[model samples]
Target: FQPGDRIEVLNGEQRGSKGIVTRTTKDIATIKLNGFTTPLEFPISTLRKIFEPGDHVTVINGEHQGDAGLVLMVEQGQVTFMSTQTSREVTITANNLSK
Candidate 1:
């Protein structure tokens, strides 16, 4: 993923955590979870592929409401999204998130 997308944590301690895609690397992606002040980085091994880049996405229902972003990147099992307001990045398991 490039940046600016919505994503969800499919597994791990942060499972179900949804946020906007932020930064993306060759092997990992960074995500800024809602309610959390800090962002998290997840490796490709822990992510699931889902969603395409440039898709419009919303949290639907969760701690984060009325929040949305754009799909930045979609690679392997990791997807990255960027917040439209703060321009923050959030990465998560592709399978855990939907458009």
Candidate 2:
């Protein structure tokens, strides 16, 4: 899928994971998981839609990275995001965010 879209992992080793769409490719997509030790990638076929940029997102990866943020930018399969809880912003490569 394109950037700025929210997606959930529906299959594969990373199944049941959710985050914002950061990057997308013909074969794989990257998403950011809350409290994730690292970003995760999955096949495009494994993704399910949730929402889009500008919508409020809930952190499902756990407590640390679970803060909500305003979607800022989506580019080159990556998303630039800012959190409402903190001024810190992160530019996650597609593998870091999910629905």
Candidate 3:
């Protein structure tokens, strides 16, 4: 039904196929099927949404560069993150990020 939602076509010529929803418009859903190089698009109604949270992202550049943490908050173009693995917290500008 929306981007980032795992989708499967329930009733169509593309039936029994499943993939990740890459994007969606008011009436069409574009899905990325792993087996095929090209993405597939179908009516929004023909797909079912499956939800899942992504893995916690990592810090690419900073004093805590190469550290793994959960992003807590964002303010004034800066991100606050807790270095959960090492038990520390540091606020870094958005520029020092990869994801």
Candidate 4:
């Protein structure tokens, strides 16, 4: 995940808590969560990207790669975003997108 992306912890005591990724490595990331003063590092596998409506993201891979847009909807692992370049809405797998 990229820095500034909102993510949710998937395990441990912090499970379900949402935070913004501050830094990332191949297997770990530093996150700053709400109500917490300092960032903490967690395994990347324990994190799930959170793409809320209105979030600005980019298509990092696949057919729409390089496109930038604001998220309009999220369902399961899919996200619907309005492309700034095309001024059209497109649905793509979240894994192919980045914040």
Candidate 5:
């Protein structure tokens, strides 16, 4: 998992809570979840890669500044987004999107 990725807990008491990834190892990820102040680490097995379809996200910076849209899908680290202004689908790196 990459830092700033939006994630969901799949097998813990925190299941269904969405959060932002802050750090990661080959087998674990540290996520700063909603409803909590400190980050928590969980096994990769319990986490689901997200920014899934229907999630509203925004661009962080660069030429994509102010770009916000609905997520369509995530392929590798590439995210398919439905542009808000253009109303067209575009492919952008997940890291480029707002966490």
Candidate 6:
């Protein structure tokens, strides 16, 4: 969670977006985003890891939570994939999905 280390968003609209630790102050970690926008502020329970293609996951954002899918590709924080139930093409933040 130190500055310059990569972190994956785990919740909110920014979930799944890739970011690098930039700076920290007042217990808030600042991140420079690669796929979306930044300097996004994140605290504990938000900092996390990078996603890999071919991973199985469930959507946890909005009403999409509980939706299952397979990882197709990852471009920074935006993960593109195919839904397991509907087989529809889907792309969203990696953070929206849980392994």
Best by TM-score: 4
Q: Write the per-residue lDDT of candidate 5 for residues 1-99, one digit (tens) a residue.
A: 689877778776888877989999999899999889999999987776566777788887568777889898887657888898899987776656764
TM-score quality measure for candidate 3:
0.47
**What would the per-residue lDDT of candidate 2 be over residues 1-99, giving only the tens digit for each residue?**
667676767777767777776787888878875557666787787776654467444344434356657667665445556776786765544434455
Q: Per-residue lDDT tens digits of candidate 3, residues 1-99?
A: 446665567788788677988887888889997587889889877765432223244666657677756667765445667676777766665545534
Error of 1 at 63 (Å): 36
For all predicted structures, in order, the TM-scores are 0.47, 0.45, 0.47, 0.70, 0.54, 0.52
Question: Sort by TM-score, best first: what order?
Answer: 4, 5, 6, 3, 1, 2
Candidate 6 lDDT over 1-99, as tens digits, reads 456666777778887777887897757888988965548788747777456798777787867777787888888678777888789978777657666
Could you tell me the TM-score of candidate 4?
A: 0.70
Model 5 ranges with Cα > 4 A deviation: 52-99
- Report the C-alpha displacement of residue 39, candidate 5, in angstroms: 0.4
Query: Could you give candidate 1's per-residue lDDT for residues 1-99 as a string of tens digits?
Result: 547765667789998777766898988988887888988898755554357888766554445445568878877656678866668977655554557
Task: Name the regions of candidate 6 deviating beyond 4 angstroms.
Answer: 1-42, 45-48
Write down the RMSD of candidate 4 (Cα, Å): 2.7
Q: Give all candidates' CA lDDT scores.
A: 0.69, 0.64, 0.65, 0.87, 0.80, 0.75
Candidate 4 — which residues are off by over 4 angstroms? 83-88
RMSD of each: 13.0, 12.3, 11.5, 2.7, 7.0, 8.1
**After superposition, candidate 1 runs with Cα above 4 Å error:** 48-99
Compared with the true structure, the alpha-carbon lDDT of candidate 3 equals 0.65
Worst 10 residues of 2 by lDDT: 55-64
